[PDB]
Write a protein that binds this ligand. Sequence first.
Ligand SMILES: [Hg+2]
Ligand SMILES: [Hg+2]
Ligand SMILES: [Hg+2]
Ligand SMILES: [Hg+2]
Length: 263
Amino acid sequence: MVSLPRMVYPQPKVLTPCRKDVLVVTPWLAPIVWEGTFNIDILNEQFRLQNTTIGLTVFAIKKYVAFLKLFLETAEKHFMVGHRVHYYVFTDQPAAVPRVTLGTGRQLSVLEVCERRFLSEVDYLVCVDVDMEFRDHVGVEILTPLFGTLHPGFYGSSREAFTYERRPQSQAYIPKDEGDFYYLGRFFGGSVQEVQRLTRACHQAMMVDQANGIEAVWHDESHLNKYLLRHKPTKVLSPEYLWDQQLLGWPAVLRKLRFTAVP
Ligand SMILES: [Hg+2]
Ligand SMILES: [Hg+2]
Ligand SMILES: [Hg+2]
Ligand SMILES: [Hg+2]
């Protein structure tokens, strides 16, 4: 709500689309974040004036603790740089967490494996996997009440091809004539309130499923897709935000590869 300062930047072009090769807004008017759609300077100003704090959560159990060093090092270089960040590392090996040097205004909490905590420590929560690395900018352009990320393997696929759970006996069930996009179960976020709302719904749906002796085809991801179908995300991130260059290369439609799996 605080007034932005004078800023000098190119005037928006009303009669000139900001990307003519991709959809930049959903049918429910949520922006789809692609490179070229946002001016990061304006967005940085808006969020900094609000002294925004972003929590990044990851689970690293067993052999996965080995991915923490690169994950954290690259996050330090590309994730919410300039803003307050609180990393939450849930692990079964507290002593094995790498000693990574953090920039000012950034902290890390190791939780050995308390939800009200998030409500008082951060404004937004971003949930990802540890076996990844940031390769380019991932900033406040993604922040919104609730966001989902387009799966790199299905962004150009028809809904019939989406690997949603197709069995009516499952709570994650989505018929062939339904569905907007196929979202990643491993990269989502939003306000603490909305994220806890999504995880609480997923947890309940998965319990009902097991009680009925059924397990969704893609587990958590299947339920996340059911949730986002029925509760439209306020922002959708393009595949730039979770790519796999080994399996998909570098298409012209992707101007940047920001976050990827480690081969
Ligand atoms: Hg989370
Ligand atoms: Hg769900
Ligand atoms: Hg779940
Ligand atoms: Hg979920």
